[PDB]
Symmetry: C3
Subunit: 238 residues, 3 copies
Amino acid sequence: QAGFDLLNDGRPETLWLGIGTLLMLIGTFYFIARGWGVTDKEAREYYAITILVPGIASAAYLAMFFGIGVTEVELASGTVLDIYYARYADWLFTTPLLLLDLALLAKVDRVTIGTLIGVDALMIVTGLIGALSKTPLARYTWWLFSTIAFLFVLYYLLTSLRSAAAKRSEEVRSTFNTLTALVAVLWTAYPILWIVGTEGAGVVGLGIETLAFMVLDVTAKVGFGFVLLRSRAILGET
Amino acid sequence: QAGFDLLNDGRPETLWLGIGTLLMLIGTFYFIARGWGVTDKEAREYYAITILVPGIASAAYLAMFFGIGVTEVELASGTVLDIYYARYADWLFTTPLLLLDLALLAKVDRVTIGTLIGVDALMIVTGLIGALSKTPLARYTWWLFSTIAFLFVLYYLLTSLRSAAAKRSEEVRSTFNTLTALVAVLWTAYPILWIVGTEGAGVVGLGIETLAFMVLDVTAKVGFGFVLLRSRAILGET
Amino acid sequence: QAGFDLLNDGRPETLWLGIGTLLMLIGTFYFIARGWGVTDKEAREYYAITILVPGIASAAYLAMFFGIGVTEVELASGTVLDIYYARYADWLFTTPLLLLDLALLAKVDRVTIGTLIGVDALMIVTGLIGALSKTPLARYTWWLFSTIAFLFVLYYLLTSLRSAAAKRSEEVRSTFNTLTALVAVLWTAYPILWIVGTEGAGVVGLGIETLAFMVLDVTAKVGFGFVLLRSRAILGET
Ligand SMILES: CC(C)CCC[C@@H](C)CCC[C@@H](C)CCC[C@@H](C)CCOC[C@@H](CO[C@H]1O[C@H](CO)[C@@H](O)[C@H](O)[C@H]1O)OCC[C@H](C)CCC[C@H](C)CCC[C@H](C)CCCC(C)C
Ligand SMILES: CC(C)CCC[C@@H](C)CCC[C@@H](C)CCC[C@@H](C)CCOC[C@@H](CO[C@H]1O[C@H](CO)[C@@H](O)[C@H](O)[C@H]1O)OCC[C@H](C)CCC[C@H](C)CCC[C@H](C)CCCC(C)C
Ligand SMILES: CC(C)CCC[C@@H](C)CCC[C@@H](C)CCC[C@@H](C)CCOC[C@@H](CO[C@H]1O[C@H](CO)[C@@H](O)[C@H](O)[C@H]1O)OCC[C@H](C)CCC[C@H](C)CCC[C@H](C)CCCC(C)C
Ligand SMILES: CC(/C=C/C=C(C)/C=C/C=C(C)/C=C/[C@H](CCC(C)(C)O)C(C)(C)O)=C\C=C\C=C(C)\C=C\C=C(C)\C=C\C=C(C)\C=C\[C@H](CCC(C)(C)O)C(C)(C)O
Ligand SMILES: CC(/C=C/C=C(C)/C=C/C=C(C)/C=C/[C@H](CCC(C)(C)O)C(C)(C)O)=C\C=C\C=C(C)\C=C\C=C(C)\C=C\C=C(C)\C=C\[C@H](CCC(C)(C)O)C(C)(C)O
Ligand SMILES: CC(/C=C/C=C(C)/C=C/C=C(C)/C=C/[C@H](CCC(C)(C)O)C(C)(C)O)=C\C=C\C=C(C)\C=C\C=C(C)\C=C\C=C(C)\C=C\[C@H](CCC(C)(C)O)C(C)(C)O
Ligand SMILES: *C/C=C(C)/C=C/C=C(C)/C=C/C1=C(C)CCCC1(C)C
Ligand SMILES: *C/C=C(C)/C=C/C=C(C)/C=C/C1=C(C)CCCC1(C)C
Ligand SMILES: *C/C=C(C)/C=C/C=C(C)/C=C/C1=C(C)CCCC1(C)C
């Protein structure tokens, strides 16, 4: 199970990267069009932040597509993995932004936002180090390290942010829940796919893995953005 | 047409990098001296931001000077280009700062500033990826990708920022215009020099190109800063 | 003089990196526990910022421990140095955060904070370039370059921040002084160890150097944090 080798370079997964690229682009320009006439300062903020997400992902996918965003990591055993490191560059900026959308919806103080971005960033960076490690001891230690950070992220999301958002209007609290839940389930799928993909146990192929990440990314990007930018929760408050 | 090989390493363009370095340094310490006694909070802000620009550029130029900020990228055809990647590292921080000076002058909200910095950053990063690409398809696709971002940058500069600045005093609006125009013409010269230089069609030599970028940088840095830090527009308002 | 080669990879300094790692971790989770029940918004801010410091250092040390955070730089003379570049990645984020703790304590405006972070960052980056340089001319020129930035950092710390903090309560002013002094002496030890270690004259071994940096880091991290998070100065004001 793989796909189609779009660049004649022996990488069938490029078919999924290509589709991923296309999807992130139309998602970016759909959001720009849809929010082009928005004058509401609170709403343009959600639009601004949310447009940048698929925008940067577009760049990351195009880079993985061309092959520029992928590198060959030789394991201690001599086994060579193709690590699409560009994903981490993507996530370093996108996850904090998505987190920022949730923070705004909850109306939590700046310290809560700083904490989330800080821990989230630590999660992605450690995830990248583990991805480029040569030893299994190191590779899985980093996975566990990043996972812990992810735990704190989910924790403050389901407590601090949740309680704050529960004090807001029914419209706002409604949308918050139907994004945090989306995040909780979608985001958790990344560490899993990672440990079962070529970066870990390797029961999943690079072709299927890429397809999976592409479905995860588009949903967590465009899907999340669609639900958010569509809600009345981004328009001031009642 | 080239210059002088200052480090005996076979790089005559170092003569232009060296001059570029020297110029960015005296520019940084001239601004520090000139603004050393400024107590006005609004003015120190312009000084602070504006001093950091030639300061970081200094580091970038010195790095390109020594050869540390340059790498050999082998094209698919086997053609080897000398990519001074350090420029992009420079721009990632300097362009947003310059943009920040214009944002402050216009007195636009934080969302407008975030948008500009976000898109600008996407412009520089994609520009760097294109610079390090091995395929012509990839190299020019990234150029076009970065150009689009540049378009949005110029667009919001000439509309959102312009309209805001037009509501301010004649002194402030005056200086804004004579910086935005400077930016519009100078900044546009970068994508051009890029597509005609060694990173593209290659009708321009690496020696001339370096000289050009050095003249562009010093003007967009020191020149911009001189006009700004000299105006009364940075001192509160009438 | 060295230590113990914990990973059987011929690096006895890993014994110091390992201890450094362990210490940064218990420091991170001690601070989290100690501040877990803090409701004071001003205090959680100090806790938040201060927890992130040993947290990121933990990641950096673990990376140097595994060997992922170290690279072999070949000097022009053919001499090969083992540069633990991860330290710089660590510092790029930690120093600004520590600086941020001092800024908050002083209650200085955002421009002062931006300036400190900007110059500090320039210090670390140039320090890294010098660390990876191949020529002695370049390596020491960067050291001097970074040192100048450090000078400005210390300067504004002992003037702008000091004078501001001197206007606050005796409790706050007291803690500020017993952190700025700690910083002034500890921080100055880095450029020294650098110029006398393998990155410079090399009178100090890589084993001793690593031990030294580990003692410096833990004190500037956990020690600084202990004194700060223990004081009443982080709780509003009298
Ligand atoms: C987050 C910050 C550090 C900067 C944003 C990250 C961007 C720069 C994303 C670019 C990533 C880049 C590395 C792409 C991968 C390219 C790939 C082809 C190269 C992979 O190798 C990377 C290794 C270098 O070693 C290798 O080369 C040498 C020389 O040829 C070989 O001898 C060696 O065997 C090879 O492996 O380096 C990986 C990076 C280290 C592990 C650095 C540790 C990172 C530290 C811990 C990050 C601290 C950031 C912290 C999480 C920020 C949180 C701040 C909050 C408190 C707000
Ligand atoms: C902006 C952020 C990502 C971090 C700031 C960038 C700094 C880290 C600047 C350092 C740049 C660094 C890469 C200098 C160039 C050094 C040069 C000698 C190496 C060039 O190779 C870089 C390649 C690695 O591949 C190569 O090595 C392997 C292994 O030896 C070979 O097999 C391969 O053939 C070689 O080509 O990697 C280039 C980086 C990728 C293309 C990553 C994609 C970047 C993503 C799309 C960035 C998203 C950032 C976004 C624009 C932020 C906007 C945020 C707003 C919403 C606020
Ligand atoms: C601060 C910003 C730029 C981004 C945060 C830095 C992160 C990306 C930390 C990652 C550092 C990374 C480079 C780890 C070292 C890995 C090590 C194994 C590779 C070392 O080589 C790095 C060289 C690449 O050249 C080498 O490879 C080529 C190709 O194989 C060889 O031909 C060559 O001989 C080798 O040496 O590149 C080093 C980076 C340049 C010196 C870039 C200059 C940096 C500019 C001046 C930074 C400006 C940032 C400024 C201080 C920000 C201040 C902003 C304030 C105004 C707010
Ligand atoms: C860094 C980290 C966690 C960081 C957490 C952070 C930053 C949290 C921040 C929280 C904040 C800011 C909260 C704010 C709140 C405020 C509220 C608010 C304002 C926000 O609303 C409040 C109320 C105050 O809380 C975890 C690392 C976690 C790291 C881990 C788990 C590491 C594991 C390592 C292993 C397992 C090594 C193993 C090594 C071995 C087995 C070595 C073996 C050697 C031999 C190896 C060989 C040779 C076999 O290969 C040996 C045997 C020793 O020689
Ligand atoms: C153009 C582009 C990409 C182009 C790609 C190309 C051409 C690819 C070609 C591929 C080929 C030919 C492949 C061939 C294969 C064979 C190959 C071979 C084998 C032969 O080699 C084969 C045949 C298929 O098999 C990307 C742009 C990408 C563009 C992007 C990412 C733009 C982002 C914009 C943002 C992020 C705006 C943001 C706007 C905001 C935040 C606006 C805010 C405003 C709010 C106002 C305020 C607050 C700021 O004042 C608002 C009013 C809401 O707009
Ligand atoms: C020192 C330095 C560079 C040194 C370079 C050297 C020595 C080079 C030597 C080269 C040689 C010998 C070459 C030989 C060649 C042959 C070589 C061979 C072949 C032999 O190998 C040959 C012979 C020519 O051919 C750089 C410093 C560089 C220094 C920098 C970049 C400083 C930056 C400062 C900032 C950015 C301040 C900022 C201040 C602010 C923002 C202040 C704000 C205050 C506002 C107050 C507030 C708000 C913060 O509270 C204010 C009051 C305005 O100051
Ligand atoms: C648009 C991209 C999104 C929403 C990405 C989310 C990514 C994560 C929640 C990634 C988590 C990871 C771990 C918990 C362990 C190690 C590796 C990661 C980076 C895959
Ligand atoms: C001090 C440096 C300044 C003001 C640099 C400005 C740079 C630009 C406006 C660069 C634009 C580019 C494109 C539009 C396409 C691809 C490459 C770039 C990065 C050269
Ligand atoms: C937790 C880490 C801390 C507090 C690190 C502080 C580091 C410095 C003050 C480093 C200064 C350096 C110079 C002045 C010159 C060149 C190299 C450096 C980066 C070691």
